[PDB]
Design a protein around this ligand. Sequence first.
Ligand SMILES: [Fe+3]
Ligand SMILES: [Fe+3]
Ligand SMILES: [Fe+3]
Ligand SMILES: [Fe+3]
Ligand SMILES: [Zn+2]
Ligand SMILES: [Zn+2]
Ligand SMILES: [Zn+2]
Ligand SMILES: [Zn+2]
Ligand SMILES: [Zn+2]
Lengths: 145, 144
Amino acid sequence: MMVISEKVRKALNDQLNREIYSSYLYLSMATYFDAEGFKEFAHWMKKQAQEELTHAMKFYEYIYERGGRVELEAIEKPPSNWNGIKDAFEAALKHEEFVTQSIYNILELASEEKDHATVSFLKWFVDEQVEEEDQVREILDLLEK
Amino acid sequence: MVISEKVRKALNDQLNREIYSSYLYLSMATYFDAEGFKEFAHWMKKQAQEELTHAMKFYEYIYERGGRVELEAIEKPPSNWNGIKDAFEAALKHEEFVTQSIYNILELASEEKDHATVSFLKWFVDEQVEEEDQVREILDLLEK
Ligand SMILES: [Fe+3]
Ligand SMILES: [Fe+3]
Ligand SMILES: [Fe+3]
Ligand SMILES: [Fe+3]
Ligand SMILES: [Zn+2]
Ligand SMILES: [Zn+2]
Ligand SMILES: [Zn+2]
Ligand SMILES: [Zn+2]
Ligand SMILES: [Zn+2]
């Protein structure tokens, strides 16, 4: 029996697929960095790509622990190229801000439905999102030289 | 109280460990600030803040399970290191000890089939893995 709403399941399935695309996007940044010779920037991107896949599997597991099912969707082709380093890290920041808004939106939905388990789940992700935007913002400040 | 007293003592002990961690990172900010590395100092400040929210997550979980928190004395952190690398190496050694301490609480709660504590702790095991790897990445970039 599923003890989440079909609309919170759908929302969480949508976020799982965003984390996979996030993963793919950061892998694509590594292909750029690696081609332009920045092997340490590529290495971070590959770490990030792995970590976004662990985010997606926590949603995967949560959905199944509450009796839902996961359906995987097509993943769009990510950009392969940026107009230099700053451009690449700004795209990353902009994508993380979009990811955060998307989780905040699910957090509003699950509150209106008084789903306390899902609320508790997403608060861990909010905190990680605040950390990840500030990591990228910090990179961007250091690049300003 | 719906946690065992052993798990309660272990989580209260980790809480005081996270408080000391915060204090340690703040002390690293005083070294970096004194030596003119303003950006390392800022990172250490944000980490001290973060460690405090780690501490307060253990706080709130202990009370949600019916326990009480008890604050212990906080030891005087070092305030000086041999150089930049020596400082981040102490940060790594310290995050490794925090990871082992947390893993041991995880082992204990799994023996006692305390699934809420296991679930609570797994967030921190993943955060400790990421933070250890952050220190490691900074160290490798220094060797350049
Ligand atoms: Fe993510
Ligand atoms: Fe992310
Ligand atoms: Fe911590
Ligand atoms: Fe830590
Ligand atoms: Zn590296
Ligand atoms: Zn994190
Ligand atoms: Zn992260
Ligand atoms: Zn800074
Ligand atoms: Zn952290």
